[PDB]
């Protein structure tokens, strides 16, 4: 939206009533642990390939 705040040094503006609100924050912390065997992946249990 568009909001004009009229600056004037004779006046301040202080609110009267205050509320309490709850929000949400989501943060990743870790990912999936993996491990790779060499010969099983690349050669697939072939002895002459190994």
């Amino acid at each position: 939206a568009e909001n004009s705040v009229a600056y004037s040094n004779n006046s301040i503006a202080i609110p009267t009533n205050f509320t309490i609100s709850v929000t949400t924050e989501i943060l990743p912390v870790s990912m999936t642990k993996t491990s790779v065997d060499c010969t099983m992946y690349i050669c697939g249990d072939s002895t002459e390939c190994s």
Binding site: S35, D37, T39, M40, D45, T47
Partner: peptide, 29 residues
């Protein structure tokens, strides 16, 4: 690890995989 002295810890070495005993061939009867 290519070493004669191995420090304390867990290490991945090999597989429980079996090497093939023989060769099998199969055709329609």
């Amino acid at each position: 690890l290519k070493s004669f002295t191995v420090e304390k810890g867990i290490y991945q070495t090999s597989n429980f995989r079996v090497q093939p005993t023989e060769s099998i061939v199969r055709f329609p009867n």
